[PDB]
Design a binder for this molecule. Sequence first.
Ligand SMILES: [Fe+2]
Length: 187
Amino acid sequence: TELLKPRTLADLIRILHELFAGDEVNVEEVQAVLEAYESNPAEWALYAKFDQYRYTRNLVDQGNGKFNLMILCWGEGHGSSIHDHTDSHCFLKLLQGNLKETLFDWPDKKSNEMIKKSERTLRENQCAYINDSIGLHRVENVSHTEPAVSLHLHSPPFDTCHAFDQRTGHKNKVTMTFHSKFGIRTP
Ligand SMILES: [Fe+2]
């Protein structure tokens, strides 16, 4: 239970394997360790594979089945849908640039516009946390000049989620696709 500062991305991954060795998740400890890793671009360049038209999801580690650790690459103006996290934990740490996170409440079953609950700017090396009990969110790189890179941890791993239509609250099931795995492009 003794949290040391991760010296490198590899060290962080080793620490995460220790923190997820059991059946439950100490959220504050995981967030603290992710926050404490100082982004070093040389260590994650292998995973930072961008696409011109949308953000990419790049698998880094499968956590011995306990978590998916992935790097997301956001071109200028790239953003996500409003989405949930499939009854799992989601941690989001900025490795480069800034992302805007907008929080939404779960919609009522009547068709209505989803109104933002709040928003914040996540800055380099900050780590955010979300789960379905907190709400829904959208993540966006609103920069016109700076690509963003973020490090995401999902526990347990999940490969589907729901996207929500901001005008109605209607949801559709979406399959999560990986742009690359362990540095290898996976078309
Ligand atoms: Fe998310």
